[PDB]
């Protein structure tokens, strides 16, 4: 297993060697913390101050324990920075005695997810998932796989038509062959790839994450894919895109399922996507969008769209237009 685009990107290049990086700190004392706003596995996130620039920021200060994952993450933001719709660090900092490192990041008005999604539109649908297609597309041509794609992780400042991709804290260099973790990503959001122990897997992982939120925006139904734990996982995916199909991604991989999770499996037809319409969301499914979802959600992470070519598709014909009519008005 290979991906079909990108296999050369740390393989032609101190770039993906993050273990050897040392890092700059700035100094702690430039940043001030005036509220927690969310925790994470391994860290806090407050709202700060930059006391000379006066202007908002994000602190995550990371438990100074992990110090390879500490710099795997600054790594991967400071080959991203300036990226389209990469979440910009700004400094990266320490107590001096405590030695606990503090990520300092730019600051988004967003909206969480859980109250905007049920207020987008499919005009907004279209223009956000585009704005996170341009970020996946650049960490994708970086060599670099996000691993944690989900919407807690897209913040949207909705006012400003604004959208940021957050907490690379999981993301990872793609090597050609090199077998990954499979305990990445979110439960509802994990590729079928992890969830029947393919190890070799690239940057599709994150195309099926985007098709999961996407599925989850189109027909409002989120999460789209809702398992009770990680084996419950792989049934509702296979409930929806059958059995037939798993069963032959399987046979093409060399994979054969614990005979205890085959069984939880079952056999089922693949559904059509037609069946997820329903009288509040019809206004947000075309045959395009339904014709792009299905070319993200299969079980087969070769034949899924790469970030490139979902761009590409008709679906955000009109976004690319509006684009394109905007940059020839403004020349
Ligand atoms: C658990 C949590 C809490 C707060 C926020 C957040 C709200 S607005 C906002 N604007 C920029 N960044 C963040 S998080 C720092 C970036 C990262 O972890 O990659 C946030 C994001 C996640
Ligand atoms: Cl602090």
């Given at each position: 297993?290979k991906?079909?685009?990108?296999?050369?990107?740390?393989?032609?290049?101190?770039?993906?060697?993050?273990?050897?990086?040392?890092?700059?700190?700035?100094?702690?004392?430039?940043?001030?913390?005036?509220?927690?706003?969310?925790?994470?596995?391994?860290?806090?996130?407050?709202?700060?101050?930059?006391?000379?620039?006066?202007?908002?920021?994000?602190?995550?200060?990371?438990?100074?324990?992990?110090?390879?994952?500490?710099?795997?993450?600054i790594?991967?933001?400071?080959?991203?920075?300036?990226?389209?719709?990469?979440?910009?660090?700004?400094?990266?900092?320490?107590?001096?005695?405590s030695?606990?490192?503090?990520?300092?990041?730019?600051?988004?008005?967003?909206?969480?997810?859980?109250?905007?999604?049920?207020?987008?539109?499919?005009?907004?649908?279209?223009?956000?998932?585009?704005?996170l297609?341009?970020?996946?597309?650049?960490?994708?041509?970086?060599?670099?796989?996000?691993?944690?794609?989900?919407?807690?992780?897209?913040?949207?400042?909705?006012?400003?038509?604004?959208?940021?991709?957050?907490?690379?804290?999981?993301?990872?260099?793609?090597?050609?062959?090199?077998?990954?973790?499979?305990?990445?990503?979110?439960?509802?959001?994990?590729?079928?790839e992890?969830?029947?122990?393919?190890?070799?897997?690239?940057?599709?992982?994150?195309?099926?994450?985007?098709?999961?939120?996407?599925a989850?925006?189109?027909?409002?139904?989120?999460?789209?894919?809702?398992?009770?734990?990680?084996?419950?996982?792989?049934?509702?995916?296979?409930?929806?895109?059958?059995?037939?199909?798993?069963?032959?991604?399987?046979?093409?991989?060399?994979?054969?399922?614990?005979?205890?999770?085959?069984?939880?499996?079952?056999?089922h037809?693949?559904?059509?996507?037609?069946?997820?319409?329903?009288?509040?969301?019809?206004?947000?499914?075309?045959?395009?969008?339904?014709?792009?979802?299905?070319?993200?959600?299969?079980?087969?992470?070769?034949?899924?769209?790469?970030?490139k070519?979902?761009?590409?598709?008709?679906?955000?014909?009109?976004?690319?237009?509006?684009?394109?009519?905007?940059?020839?008005?403004?020349l």
């Amino acid at each position: 297993s290979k991906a079909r685009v990108y296999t050369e990107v740390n393989v032609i290049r101190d770039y993906w060697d993050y273990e050897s990086l040392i890092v700059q700190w700035g100094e702690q004392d430039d940043y001030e913390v005036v509220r927690k706003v969310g925790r994470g596995k391994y860290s806090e996130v407050f709202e700060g101050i930059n006391v000379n620039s006066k202007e908002k920021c994000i602190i995550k200060i990371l438990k100074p324990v992990k110090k390879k994952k500490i710099r795997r993450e600054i790594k991967i933001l400071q080959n991203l920075c300036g990226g389209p719709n990469i979440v910009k660090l700004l400094d990266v900092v320490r107590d001096q005695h405590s030695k606990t490192p503090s990520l300092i990041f730019e600051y988004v008005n967003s909206t969480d997810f859980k109250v905007l999604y049920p207020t987008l539109t499919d005009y907004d649908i279209r223009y956000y998932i585009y704005e996170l297609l341009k970020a996946l597309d650049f960490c994708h041509s970086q060599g670099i796989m996000h691993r944690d794609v989900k919407p807690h992780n897209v913040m949207i400042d909705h006012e400003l038509r604004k959208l940021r991709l957050i907490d690379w804290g999981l993301a990872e260099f793609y090597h050609p062959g090199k077998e990954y973790n499979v305990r990445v990503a979110s439960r509802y959001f994990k590729g079928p790839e992890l969830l029947v122990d393919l190890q070799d897997y690239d940057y599709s992982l994150d195309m099926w994450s985007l098709g999961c939120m996407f599925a989850g925006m189109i027909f409002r139904k989120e999460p789209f894919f809702y398992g009770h734990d990680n084996q419950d996982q792989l049934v509702k995916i296979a409930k929806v895109l059958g059995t037939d199909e798993l069963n032959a991604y399987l046979n093409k991989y060399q994979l054969e399922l614990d005979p205890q999770l085959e069984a939880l499996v079952g056999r089922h037809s693949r559904k059509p996507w037609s069946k997820f319409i329903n009288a509040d969301n019809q206004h947000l499914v075309s045959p395009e969008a339904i014709d792009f979802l299905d070319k993200l959600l299969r079980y087969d992470h070769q034949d899924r769209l790469t970030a490139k070519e979902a761009m590409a598709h008709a679906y955000f014909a009109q976004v690319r237009a509006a684009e394109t009519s905007r940059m020839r008005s403004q020349l």
